[PDB]
Amino acid sequence: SSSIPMPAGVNPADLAAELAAVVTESVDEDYLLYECDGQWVLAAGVQAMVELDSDELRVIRDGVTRRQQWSGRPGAALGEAVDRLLLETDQAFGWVAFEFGVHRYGLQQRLAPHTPLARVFSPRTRIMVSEKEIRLFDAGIRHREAIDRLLATGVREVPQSRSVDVSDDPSGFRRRVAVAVDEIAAGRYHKVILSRCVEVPFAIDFPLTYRLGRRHNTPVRSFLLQLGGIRALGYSPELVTAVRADGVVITEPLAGTDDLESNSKEIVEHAISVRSSLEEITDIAEPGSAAVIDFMTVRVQHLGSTIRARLDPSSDRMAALEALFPAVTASGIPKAAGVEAIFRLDECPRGLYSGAVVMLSADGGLDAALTLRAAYQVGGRTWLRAGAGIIEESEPEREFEETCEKLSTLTPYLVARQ
Template sequence: MNDILRDSSLAAPRAVDLLQHYQPGSTLFASSRQTLLAEGVDTLLPQADHASMAAEAMAHLAERRAAGERRPVALGALPFRPDAPARLWLPRTTLFGQGVEAAEIAHAPAQPGGRRAGTVTALPSPQRYQDNVTRALAAIAAGEFEKVVLSRSLQVEAQIDLAALLQRLARRNPIGYTFAFDLADRPASRTLIGASPELLLARRGRRVVSHPLAGSIPRSADPVEDARRAAGLLRSAKDRHEHALVVDAVAAALRPFCRELTVPAEPTLLSTPTMWHLGTEVAGQLDDPTVSSLQLALALHPTPAVCGHPTAPARDFIQAVEGFDRGLFTGLIGWCSDDGDGEWAVTIRCAEAHKDRVSLYAGAGIVAGSDPALELAETAAKLRTMLNAMDLESALEQQL
């Protein structure tokens, strides 16, 4: 790592500098709170159930702290399904920097993050996705569950410039969680890269925050129409119901850990360059400050923002109809330090890149009143977060 970045007499490096030092093979996680750039693998946690892996990571962190390391961290990308492979590791070196500043990042170089799309495979096809939504609506009407999140994937042949893609994502999504995680022990160097707008859990000392999102509408380039859509979303009974299911589940999962928990009664609007979302910031004070950010994040996962309500029948339905393996998509991604502090985002608006292939993902929550064509359009708009940063939006317009 560059010595200028490491000089401890200077203030923490700026996010924009850490982003510029990212190279494929390293790992970066950036938010408005802080940025973290890590290299290498010191300890890779063996596959086990996620709670055991988390406990083992904390034990390794305590050892490293006892050995004199100033702020050891564990990095992780944990999958949607509890039985799918997780990646949780202690890096060889970690550098903490400042949070992303929109004004600084606006001047970051931003060459295209991808080029030349080749073959594109949609899993499932757009038609089949709409059929899945119709089936979900029938299951909801039959009382099998109240909400399910159905997703789809685009597998694209394209030349990806990971460093440029990461900078572009951070530049376009300065209030989100931008990440590029090296998954190198998986078949020949893969990178999970994205810009999630959704905070699963942040912990600093006793303070914990979650910012669930659910209920969405695509943005419009026309400012009048864009404002109309935002106002309509805020009023929509269907979207408020879809949102409330997530907030209730997040509050119920956090409450046992907290001596104080604030749950606003009304959602607010949150925007990304492609989407409007309903969001609610849930904040609390931990009862027991030894509970780590990773343990808390796992207690929340999977929220109904990525799975459904109730969890078990929604998960079974996803498994039965979705038609592809989500892997790390709709899991959790972030870091936890030895004192338990950390930040975990929901792994959405992301892609897994491997050589000249990239798999993109997007999902949408289905409740009574959802419309299959609108849900398809919503997933298309969500896919644009990555496609735009790769400059492939117009090349793939027909496939969305």
């Protein structure tokens, strides 16, 4: 059957993460698990893959890689290829780099060749885990048998975590901050977010770390993946974009930090962001469809606003994502200038950090979550990355401390490789 009853006492995050580890290894496949609105979707197995790089677009199907050059907007390029996958299957999953959002500002020339912009795939099988049920899509006996074996076994106990020191500043985050402050004071831009990488000196178990962290984090969206040599996990603090089948587009910028409601620094910054999103959404919206619906409402508690619109017929979901990308929250104000500065003052390319993780539907749906509070493994390297907004009054030591706080979303929950 399509449906299985959820076992009592079992958290959905825990079960989906267990499925992700056990079932995929069994059948030799890559995966992405995405948490959206009480559903944990495990997209298992790469049926077809879209790789969009700075200098090339690749579609790999059935063992055949078909390479194309592309020009113009990255979203249009990505959209066309993804649309093709979605004729064949219902949903597509992936990640989008920070670097995806640089073309709109004409910064693409800065990118080295073979710089990844996006990886989007359609799954061989889907498993959806929620509180009530497990739903199976395109699951063969092999997958089905595996889910069945796990379900019987139950979830593994999470081992004790292993600590890491975040006090070093090898990349000189503090000095880099100062430089930003000077540029701000000189009126180059209002804001930039700068970040630092922290290497983790041991290998971690990604699914087990994801479970431990999820227990102590309540995020807007979350993810765990093994894709194309990359392991990653994260607790996304913001939604970049949600586009519905009906054409309604949403973005929800959050303020961060009683005194949230009254504090001036936040309010000015949140308002400026709200203005930015509204302006961006407007370019892709039916005239007169754009509104801010829940302004500066308190929603951990956060300040946030909901910006909504109707996707114009001339435009599409990728265009909406490009209009809103990268998020102000991890870039700067004004955006073009903040992004420019990031090439200069931060370690580039960013890749997954400050990019998005995406779920797309054949119905026209898009869900894109901002990648922050995440861990990465590529090659032999395991790392964490956190950053801070920098404005004219910012202090390098305080900003360093801020990074440490953000790192603490993950630093206590690292489970070493098994």
